[PDB]
Symmetry: C2
Subunit: 109 residues, 2 copies
Amino acid sequence: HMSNPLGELVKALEKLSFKPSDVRIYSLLLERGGMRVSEIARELDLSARFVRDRLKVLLKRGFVRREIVEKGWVGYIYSAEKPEKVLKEFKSSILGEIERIEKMFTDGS
Amino acid sequence: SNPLGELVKALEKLSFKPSDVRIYSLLLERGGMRVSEIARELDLSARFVRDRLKVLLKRGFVRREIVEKGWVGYIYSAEKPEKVLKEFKSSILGEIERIEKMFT
Ligand SMILES: [Cl-]
Ligand SMILES: [Cl-]
Ligand SMILES: [Cl-]
């Protein structure tokens, strides 16, 4: 019945895991520059809905940003945050998770 | 080469097998044990338990003492949770820093 630091870390790693498709989207954008949902979908042979779904996650995690295009067509494209930014955000997220887990394992009072 | 791909690889290396969690739990709950005892209780291969304990030892999550009453063997025990978290934090920070340097 005892709480388990390894088990808690497993849950944290799952929460911060990446789908393979997230890696493909991020890597495509870093290489090619900002792209529309439709362009990403065609390039990677994924559905537009699935791409939108993963973009929401990557935006909230701070790994991708959006920016307006006004070039006849008007809409948003999506751009990779730079590696230094991605790694800064990931570091903050995992440290946050560890800090929460630490509260379960304090000694004394 | 991209930071998410490198994080995936690093996070795989820092991952735990479900058995690791069970091995740690057993040692924390019941105290220091021999490999054969852990394997019996968990219904795992003794070789497998042995190899996972070697991984956990290198990571700083278990310790061992040599004992020789008859045949030589190791008694493994759980490191305390705060040491586990401290070591894990150090390790994952080290990995992120290494990946940071790949790009700088
Ligand atoms: Cl996927
Ligand atoms: Cl679009
Ligand atoms: Cl042994």
